Design a protein around this motif. Structure first.
Motif, mmCIF file in Angstrom:
data_model
loop_
_atom_site.group_PDB
_atom_site.id
_atom_site.type_symbol
_atom_site.label_atom_id
_atom_site.label_comp_id
_atom_site.label_asym_id
_atom_site.label_seq_id
_atom_site.Cartn_x
_atom_site.Cartn_y
_atom_site.Cartn_z
ATOM 1 N N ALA C 7 0.827 -1.201 0.000
ATOM 2 C CA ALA C 7 0.000 0.000 0.000
ATOM 3 C C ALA C 7 0.861 1.251 0.000
ATOM 4 C CB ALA C 7 -0.932 -0.009 1.212
ATOM 5 N N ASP C 8 1.629 1.449 1.067
ATOM 6 C CA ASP C 8 2.505 2.606 1.130
ATOM 7 C C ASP C 8 3.528 2.584 -0.005
ATOM 8 O OD1 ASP C 8 3.336 4.971 2.132
ATOM 9 O OD2 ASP C 8 4.497 4.119 3.787
ATOM 10 N N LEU C 9 4.472 1.640 0.041
ATOM 11 C CA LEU C 9 5.625 1.673 -0.859
ATOM 12 C C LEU C 9 5.220 1.821 -2.321
ATOM 13 C CD1 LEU C 9 7.884 -1.106 0.708
ATOM 14 C CD2 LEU C 9 8.311 1.355 0.723
ATOM 15 N N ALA C 11 2.230 2.968 -3.589
ATOM 16 C CA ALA C 11 1.704 4.322 -3.715
ATOM 17 C C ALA C 11 2.770 5.354 -3.381
ATOM 18 C CB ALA C 11 0.473 4.505 -2.830
ATOM 19 N N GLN C 12 3.787 4.963 -2.609
ATOM 20 C CA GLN C 12 4.994 5.778 -2.520
ATOM 21 C C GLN C 12 5.766 5.742 -3.829
ATOM 22 O OE1 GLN C 12 6.976 4.121 0.879
ATOM 23 N NE2 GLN C 12 6.142 5.660 2.279
ATOM 24 N N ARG C 14 4.426 4.973 -6.498
ATOM 25 C CA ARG C 14 3.525 5.750 -7.339
ATOM 26 C C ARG C 14 3.690 7.234 -7.059
ATOM 27 N NH1 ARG C 14 -2.794 4.507 -7.296
ATOM 28 N NH2 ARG C 14 -2.000 2.557 -8.208
ATOM 29 N N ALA C 15 3.708 7.619 -5.777
ATOM 30 C CA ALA C 15 4.115 8.979 -5.440
ATOM 31 C C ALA C 15 5.494 9.275 -6.002
ATOM 32 C CB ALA C 15 4.099 9.186 -3.928
ATOM 33 N N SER C 18 4.142 8.962 -9.967
ATOM 34 C CA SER C 18 3.141 9.932 -10.399
ATOM 35 C C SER C 18 3.809 11.116 -11.079
ATOM 36 C CB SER C 18 2.302 10.388 -9.213
ATOM 37 O OG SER C 18 1.617 9.289 -8.644
ATOM 38 N N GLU C 19 4.589 11.889 -10.320
ATOM 39 C CA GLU C 19 5.548 12.816 -10.911
ATOM 40 C C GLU C 19 6.450 12.112 -11.914
ATOM 41 O OE1 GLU C 19 8.135 14.129 -7.763
ATOM 42 O OE2 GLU C 19 8.372 12.072 -7.025
ATOM 43 N N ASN D 411 -2.677 10.853 -6.247
ATOM 44 C CA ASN D 411 -1.595 9.956 -6.628
ATOM 45 C C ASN D 411 -0.313 10.255 -5.862
ATOM 46 O OD1 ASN D 411 -2.937 10.314 -9.878
ATOM 47 N ND2 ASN D 411 -3.102 8.477 -8.601
ATOM 48 N N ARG D 412 0.376 11.334 -6.228
ATOM 49 C CA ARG D 412 1.709 11.565 -5.684
ATOM 50 C C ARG D 412 1.641 12.105 -4.266
ATOM 51 N NH1 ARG D 412 0.648 14.721 -9.727
ATOM 52 N NH2 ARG D 412 1.959 13.451 -11.114
ATOM 53 N N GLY D 415 1.569 8.770 -0.113
ATOM 54 C CA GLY D 415 2.405 7.617 -0.347
ATOM 55 C C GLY D 415 1.595 6.386 -0.016
ATOM 56 N N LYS D 416 0.460 6.597 0.642
ATOM 57 C CA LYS D 416 -0.470 5.531 0.992
ATOM 58 C C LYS D 416 -1.882 5.904 0.565
ATOM 59 C CE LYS D 416 -2.433 2.849 4.765
ATOM 60 N NZ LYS D 416 -2.258 1.528 4.103
#
Lengths: 57, 514, 72, 508, 517
Positions: C7-9, C11-12, C14-15, C18-19, D411-412, D415-416
């Motif tokens: 979830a975190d990593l 989407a991290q 992805r974070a 994303s950029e 999204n960015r 992080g969760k």
């Protein structure tokens, strides 16, 4: 007495006050409409799309 | 109709149901021993380590079940201490004779021979008994203290006892000359120094009702003329409950200024018949407390009658259901009345009383649920300290003597029998179970510990016994782990007979058959 | 596979992506996000294109048979 | 006590609001399929309902979770307008959203803050998508209209909705920033006119004056009274009770005739031909008052006095006895008129202005009810239209833009919380789905595209679910106050977020 | 019945605490989740407070009753400290049962916790043993009421509430007495107010206002008539109300009630008190006569509250009308009916400054929850602040101390050959669930979370920094300002461990069932 049964007695009584005649006749075409809906919903057609069809009818 | 049942099936139904009720007492009574929670009936809950307390609250159907009820009480009516021990012993015999009844063999001599060692034991008990009176000083306050030290830690407090035992000392002597156990009443609080109790001869008062300013109301008197009162002083005093009303025309303002009169009368009936501190066992009204405030005379309400009684016995006075105080002995007085807050609640201390053998303890426990057993440790010490007083001869505690008595019977287990060693082997063993219960309910090895004592009991040792905090071998008499010899004597009397009694009965009639 | 936070990593990451982050990925060895410069966990274009190839086919091809006739 | 635990209470918090969030969204969106409220639980009946509360409230709420939404979406409706439909669904949508996350157990810490931030993202995106059409007053009139157009739309009204297209805008304009029933006084009455409603002069009341009183009065100086008679006025001598035997039972009803007459005398000290009070009488007293010369005009409209007093300079007050404590007022004419088959006495001579009276004629009370409520929401939202003239395109355009701008942020930025923040955006796109089927039209090919389509910048373009088409939300006038839209974003998040923070329900 | 012992009741013990503790540990702290709890009355109560959860529950077992009551002590004592003392008390059972499952006798394990509870409260002592006064503490008090007010998730701008709690507690509970006193704090407030609207009114504010606006809305300093006298129906303990049935019976009813109140309002005004506060206040008929004699005065007052204007105002008491004298009167600094900006909250202040014997916090909020929100917020602030006002003793909380306490004991455990090292271990092992359960409410890995701090507590050798209690990303108990009275930090321990001990010495259970509340 049933959710769709109560509209029927209404439907009958209205054509009387609407006309004075056709008291049965409004219901005889009621089940007529009640069938076509099925095949459509059996065809899967959307009921509100089926709805204005009644207007178009 | 009416029922009766004889027979070994019933006679064993006797002994079976007999050992059912001892279940309660067969846990508790030890410092690492257990307490009992009996929550009975409507959801009423009770926490008592004392068996004779809970057992009588618990259901006992059977004659044997009811026979052991007084057996605990029998020790409870004696020392107030040791109910569970005397009850535990009786059921033990039944386990021991259980072969014989399943063998089917009980000559009535077997129970008749239980009485033999019962004497011989309580003989050797009072034989080996040693007076603590001339042994310890004259004032005997070290008699008190070393019985106070070790009887505070035989349930809970092994730290405070260094500080408390010396108070358990002087509280016993002061109160004694009066055997009332109310005058030692200990006052629990919190917010002061916890695990610090002060012995105060004067009675702190839990409750007093004083309003309409607390500093325009005198809270202290150096001659309280004490109104010890059972009287309620009501908010508003009606003239009648019938043939009167309210507002329908005239009585609107007529009743009220008249309503004030009975209170003007009755609230003063305390004052002109005399008072300074007014202790009412029942509440004081607010405008009534304004009255007492306006009267500058200390008013208390909802006072416990017992606080009145300790004061009653402190003042030579008495409580009054009358607002009329007609004498100093029906009224009360002291040479000190002081309201103070130790722990954050209003106390009213009556000190320097005309009598005051009362010993009040302002106590604070380490926490909420932990605070109570200290006081139970305090009184339990106070009890057996007084019981070390009420019996000069005080032997080793922690079941030290029973082990030797077992071997003393294991002597007869060798010596006596054409037969009865079967008894003497059975009977004696049941002794050792009661201090065994301690090592048990403390989770330490009775057999080991008890037999480690027995190797020295083989040496001829007698007072060799268990210090029941560690559950370890020692000499209990020298450790001052103690109870008087009669307490030892009193135990074997009932518990032997209960077995004997219930054995003589194989038949219980039920007349109602209901 | 490691038992860390996807979830975190993700989407991290992805974070991160994303950029967009072309330099970094989630290191299951480390348990934490890590460089892809060829930090050593960067893998050949050969495999990671073709691994993408074959199963992309099969799924939609599994979609392709609604009709299955099993004569066993 | 009885403690619902983590497993049931939240799934109960899931289902119950979701179970009540289903019916009103069928009704909802352009060409929303009506819900038929079935009353078998009180009477046995059918009721046709697009209305959230009528759906919601007429069903008593039992489930603790069904409470809050029906409670929160209700006040959201009285406050911000049509909130019973939105906030119920929208929160139930987010509750539909939480479940996969909860199936994944996304932390209750994470989801609240995730939806907390994404709520702003949409609120800002809505704001970003919100633009003032109220730059010019006539544009603001239209902005009020275009926003009322989204407020007044999709109701059983016909000439009412159009009457309140101008009437709200007319009231909201001349109030300069507000909307009120004090600027326009609603009178909902029977009549041959079905949806027809007009702006009354003075005010009218429903009753006929027979007997010896003339049905019309000229040169009428209004004496306003909050005080009147029950036909019996409690006083010193009015307490007489003689009843003991059955004869005194026969005598007692007749004393009422003695009581009615002295009441006429207190008004004569005032010396006025026209006395209005807020209280009513029978015919037999109607026989008494017109004989004494002081005409009893009974049960004056509370708003009717306020209608005059605002225009006529009169004062509103309480506890009338003598004319001094309540200021006088003036109607040019006190007359009784024939309205359809209804015979009504009518006050007039003052026309429109600050205070207006709005007569609502209808075949039923059904056609009357929505008109005051559709205006109720219009006035407040058009009051909101003053605060923000921002009108962001309704019918999913506002919706499908927000989830977009949420997405990149969803999204960015996390992080969760993309777990939450994106699930948030999903609910925004759910309302266009539950209409698309109601339009018969595809949600999918529409939504993800048409969002991206207009999220790539065709803002006027949007979802016309009348026709089901991608359509212009400008020319259709489907757009509404950024306020009314921001606020329904505010409540529903909580109604979903609140019961999420509820993992346990104890029952004492 | 049945005597239920061995694992039988040992379950019935370990059973109840778990269902209890978990809704509390899911509601634990600010990250603790807000639990809607509906009665059999059908009424939603949202509870993030374990004590309120405890107030909401009664779970069937005798301990679950007592656990509700357990926190109430420290809730009365410390305010904050309600939830943690329970949630961990059940964790000991988890610990202890396994330990008994390890074969360690119940009284053995029972004792070692308390035995190790020394360092628990003792290691806390070393953090801040400090003491400060009111004007000094007010910064630590608001800093602690950063956390305590925020413990209800309402601290924002509420340093107003903190600062009025600063001077409220010292007034009532003196720093020198070191005795708990909230009694002279007069809890007061009304629905419809604001969180941001809150007041400390040093005097007493009575609900009733002036009988007329025509009569002045200001009563001057002092000269208040404290009385029990009827100006309306008296309402004694018991009397039945009979009315008038006749015309000739109605007239005289108006004259008499006029004739006495005039003289009474006269005599009161003649007594020289320009506010008559009557334990039996005014009817609407006594109001106009009060206006006839032209005196400002108060309508119906609660029975004891006329004492509350006797105590708090320093005015010497006159109980009743019959005794009226100018010497003994009620006092007021200034008498004003005060609206706070929400007229929904409207009080007549009987103002006390020189002699104030009841300090009055006035709390406000839009709803019944919002006041109660601010109420239990500030009240738990109030108590920690009281604890800190007497001695300002804090620690860096949220498990940062629990780990640091877990060091010594679990270490000190093996230092001892004694069996209780296992208890001491499990003692120090039971401590860390709080940041764990916090991290769970904080929505983080609870397991590393604790050790993140021990990695710190390795480095730190002290709670200062910590994990996230606020979910704000700064891992601190320090700059995050998780700061709470070290007293109450020690109150959870002694209450938790010693209650469980008393729960543990009892496996002996006589109940018809297993767990009976």
């Amino acid at each position: 007495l049933h959710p769709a049964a109560r509209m029927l007695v209404e439907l009958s009584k209205a054509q009387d006050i609407e006309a004075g005649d056709g008291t049965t006749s409004v219901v005889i075409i009621a089940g007529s409409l009640l069938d076509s809906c099925t095949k459509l919903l059996q065809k899967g057609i959307h009921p509100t799309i089926i709805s204005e069809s009644f207007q178009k009818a | 109709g009416t029922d009766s049942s004889q027979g070994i099936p019933q006679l064993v139904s006797n002994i079976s149901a007999c050992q059912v009720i001892a279940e309660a007492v067969r846990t508790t009574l030890g410092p690492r021993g257990m307490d009992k929670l009996i929550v009975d009936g409507r959801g009423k809950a009770t926490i008592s380590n004392d068996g004779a307390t809970i057992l009588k609250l618990l259901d006992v159907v059977h004659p044997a079940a009811k026979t052991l009820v007084d057996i605990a009480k029998s020790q409870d009516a004696e020392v107030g201490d040791g109910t569970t021990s005397v009850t535990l012993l009786a059921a033990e015999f039944l386990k021991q004779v259980k072969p014989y009844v399943e063998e089917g063999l009980h000559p009535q001599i077997i129970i008749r021979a239980f009485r033999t060692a019962t004497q011989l034991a309580v003989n050797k008990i009072k034989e080996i008994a040693v007076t603590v009176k001339k042994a310890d000083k004259v004032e005997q306050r070290k008699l008190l203290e070393k019985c106070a030290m070790t009887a505070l830690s035989s349930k809970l407090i092994s730290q405070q006892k260094a500080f408390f035992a010396k108070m358990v000392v002087d509280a016993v002597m002061m109160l004694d000359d009066l055997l009332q156990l109310k005058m030692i009443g200990i006052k629990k609080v919190q917010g002061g120094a916890l695990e610090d109790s002060q012995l105060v001869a004067g009675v702190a008062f839990k409750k007093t009702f004083s309003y309409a300013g607390f500093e325009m109301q005198p809270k202290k008197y150096h001659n309280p003329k004490i109104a010890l009162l059972n009287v309620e002083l009501e908010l508003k005093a009606e003239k009648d409950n019938a043939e009167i009303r309210v507002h329908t025309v005239e009585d609107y303002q007529a009743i009220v200024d008249a309503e004030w009169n009975i209170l003007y009368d009755k609230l003063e009936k305390i004052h002109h018949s005399g008072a300074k501190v007014v202790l009412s066992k029942l509440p004081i009204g607010d405008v009534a407390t304004q009255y007492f405030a306006d009267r500058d005379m200390f008013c208390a309400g909802r006072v416990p009658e017992e606080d009145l009684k300790r004061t009653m016995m402190a003042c030579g006075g008495s409580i009054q259901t009358s607002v009329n105080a007609l004498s100093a002995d029906v009224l009360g007085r002291c040479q000190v009345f002081e309201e103070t807050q130790i722990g954050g609640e209003r106390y009213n201390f009556f000190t320097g009383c005309p009598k005051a053998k009362t010993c009040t303890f302002i106590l604070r426990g380490g926490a909420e649920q932990f605070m109570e057993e200290t006081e139970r440790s305090l009184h339990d010490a106070i009890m057996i300290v007084r019981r070390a007083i009420k019996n000069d001869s005080v032997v080793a505690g922690g079941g030290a003597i029973e082990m030797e008595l077992s071997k003393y019977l294991r002597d007869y287990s060798r010596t006596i029998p054409g037969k009865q060693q079967l008894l003497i082997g059975a009977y004696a063993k049941a002794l050792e179970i009661i201090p065994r219960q301690l090592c048990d309910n403390a989770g330490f090895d009775a057999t080991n510990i008890l037999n480690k004592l027995r190797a020295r009991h083989a040496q001829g040792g007698t007072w060799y016994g268990v210090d029941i905090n560690n559950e370890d071998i020692a000499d209990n008499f020298e450790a001052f782990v103690w109870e008087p010899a009669m307490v030892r004597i009193n135990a074997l009397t009932a518990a032997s007979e209960a077995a004997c009694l219930i054995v003589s009965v194989d038949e219980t009639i039920k007349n109602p058959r209901s | 596979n490691a038992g860390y936070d996807s979830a975190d990593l993700v989407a991290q990451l992805r974070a991160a992506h994303s950029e967009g982050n072309t330099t970094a990925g989630l290191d299951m060895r480390e348990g934490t996000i890590g460089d892809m410069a060829i930090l050593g966990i960067t893998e050949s274009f050969q495999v990671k294109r073709q691994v993408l190839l074959s199963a992309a086919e099969a799924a939609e091809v599994i979609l392709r048979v609604d009709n299955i006739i099993k004569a066993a | 006590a009885d403690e619902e635990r983590a497993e049931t209470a939240r799934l109960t918090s899931f289902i119950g609001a979701i179970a009540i969030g289903d019916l009103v969204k069928s009704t909802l969106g352009p060409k929303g399929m009506d819900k038929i409220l079935l009353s078998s639980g009180r009477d046995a009946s059918l009721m046709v309902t697009n209305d959230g509360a009528t759906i919601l409230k007429n069903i008593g709420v039992d489930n603790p979770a069904a409470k809050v939404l029906v409670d929160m979406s209700r006040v959201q409706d009285d406050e911000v307008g049509d909130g019973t439909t939105s906030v119920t669904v929208l929160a139930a949508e987010l509750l539909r959203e939480a479940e996969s996350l909860i199936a994944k157990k996304i932390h209750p810490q994470t989801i609240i803050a995730g939806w907390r931030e994404a709520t702003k993202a949409a609120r800002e995106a809505l704001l970003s998508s919100a633009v003032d059409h109220g730059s010019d007053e006539v544009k603001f009139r239209q902005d009020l209209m275009n926003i009322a157009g989204t407020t007044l739309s999709s109701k059983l009204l016909t000439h009412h909705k159009d009457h309140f297209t101008k009437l709200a805008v007319e009231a909201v304009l001349r109030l300069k920033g507000s909307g009120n029933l004090e600027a326009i006084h609603i009178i909902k009455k029977l009549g041959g006119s079905l949806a027809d409603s007009y702006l009354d002069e003075g005010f009218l009341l429903d009753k006929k004056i027979g007997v010896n009183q003339p049905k019309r009065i000229e040169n009428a100086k209004i004496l306003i009274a909050n005080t009147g008679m029950d036909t019996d006025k409690i006083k010193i001598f009015g307490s007489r009770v003689r009843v003991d035997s059955t004869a005194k039972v026969a005598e007692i009803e007749h004393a009422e005739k003695e009581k009615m007459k002295e009441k006429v005398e207190r008004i004569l000290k005032h010396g006025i031909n026209c006395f209005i009070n807020r209280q009513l009488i029978y015919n037999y007293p109607e026989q008494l008052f017109g004989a004494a010369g002081v005409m009893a005009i009974e049960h004056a409209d509370f708003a009717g006095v306020e209608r005059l007093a605002l225009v006529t300079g009169g004062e509103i007050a309480s506890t009338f006895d003598h004319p001094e404590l309540v200021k006088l007022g003036s109607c040019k004419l006190i007359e009784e008129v024939m309205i359809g088959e209804d015979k009504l006495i009518h006050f007039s001579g003052v026309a429109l202005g600050e205070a207006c009276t709005i007569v609502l004629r209808g075949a039923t009370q059904q056609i009357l009810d929505e008109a005051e409520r559709s205006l109720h929401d219009a006035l407040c939202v058009l009051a909101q239209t003053v605060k923000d003239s921002r009108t962001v395109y309704g019918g999913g355009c506002s919706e499908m833009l927000m989830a977009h701008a949420v997405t990149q942020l969803a999204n960015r930025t996390p992080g969760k919380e993309a777990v939450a923040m994106e699930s948030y955006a999903k609910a925004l796109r759910m309302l266009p789905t539950i209409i698309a089927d109601n339009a018969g039209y595809d949600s999918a090919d529409l939504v993800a595209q048409l969002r991206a389509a207009h999220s790539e910048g065709n803002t006027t373009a949007g979802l016309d679910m009348r026709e089901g088409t991608i359509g212009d939300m400008a020319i259709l006038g489907i757009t509404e106050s950024f306020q009314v839209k921001r606020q329904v974003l505010l409540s529903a998040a909580e109604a979903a977020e609140v019961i999420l923070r509820v993992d346990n329900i104890i029952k004492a | 019945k049945s005597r239920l012992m061995g694992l039988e009741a040992l379950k019935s013990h370990i059973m109840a605490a778990k269902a209890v503790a978990n809704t509390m540990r899911t509601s634990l702290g600010p990250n603790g989740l807000d639990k809607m709890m509906v009665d059999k009355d059908g009424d939603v109560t949202v509870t993030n407070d374990g004590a309120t959860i405890l107030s909401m529950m009664d779970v069937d077992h005798q301990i679950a009753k007592l656990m509700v009551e357990l926190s109430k002590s420290q809730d009365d004592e410390i305010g904050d400290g309600t939830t943690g003392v329970v949630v961990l008390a059940g964790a000991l059972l988890e610990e202890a049962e396994q330990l008994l499952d390890r074969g360690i006798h119940p009284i053995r394990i029972a004792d070692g916790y308390e035995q190790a509870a020394r360092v628990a409260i003792e290691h806390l002592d070393k953090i801040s043993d400090s003491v400060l006064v009111d004007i000094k503490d007010t910064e630590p008090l608001i800093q602690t009421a950063k956390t305590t007010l925020g413990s209800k998730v309402v601290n924002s701008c509420h340093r107003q509430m903190a600062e009025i709690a600063v001077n409220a507690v010292l007034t009532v509970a003196d720093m020198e007495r070191r005795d708990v006193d909230f009694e002279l704090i007069k809890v007061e407030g009304k629905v419809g107010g604001r969180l941001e609207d809150t007041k400390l009114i040093k005097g007493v504010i009575v609900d009733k206002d002036f009988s007329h606006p025509q009569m002045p809305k200001k009563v001057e300093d002092a000269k208040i008539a404290i009385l029990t006298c009827p100006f309306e129906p008296p309402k004694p303990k018991t009397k039945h109300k009979l009315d008038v049935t006749s015309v000739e019976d109605y007239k005289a009813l108006q004259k008499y009630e006029k004739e006495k109140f005039e003289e009474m309002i006269q005599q009161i005004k003649e007594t020289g008190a320009n506010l008559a506060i009557c334990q039996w206040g005014f009817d609407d008929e006594a109001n106009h006569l009060l206006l006839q004699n032209n005196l400002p005065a108060v309508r119906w007052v609660g029975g004891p509250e006329i004492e509350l204007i006797a105590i708090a105002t320093g005015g010497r008491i006159v109980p009743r009308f019959s005794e009226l004298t100018a010497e003994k009167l009620g006092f007021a600094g200034l008498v004003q009916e005060i609206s706070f900006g929400t007229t929904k909250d409207k009080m007549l202040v009987i103002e006390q400054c020189k002699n104030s014997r009841a300090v009055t916090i006035f709390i406000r909020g839009g709803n019944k929850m919002i006041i109660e929100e601010a109420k239990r917020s500030l009240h738990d602030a109030l108590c920690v602040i009281r604890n800190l006002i007497r001695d300002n003793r804090v620690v860096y909380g949220g498990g940062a101390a629990e780990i640091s306490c877990a060091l010594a004991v679990s270490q000190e455990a093996d230092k001892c050959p004694t069996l209780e090292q296992y208890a001491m271990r499990a003692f120090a092992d039971a401590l860390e669930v709080i940041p764990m359960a916090l991290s769970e409410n904080s929505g983080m890995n609870p397991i590393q979370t604790m050790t993140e701090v021990r990695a710190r507590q390795v480095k730190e050798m002290n709670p200062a920094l910590g994990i996230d209690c606020l979910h704000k990303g700064t891992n601190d108990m320090k700059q995050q300002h998780v700061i709470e009275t070290l007293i109450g930090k020690k109150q959870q321990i002694s209450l938790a461990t010693q209650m469980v001990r008393m729960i543990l010495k009892i496996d002996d259970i006589r109940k018809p069932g297993e767990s009976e509340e």
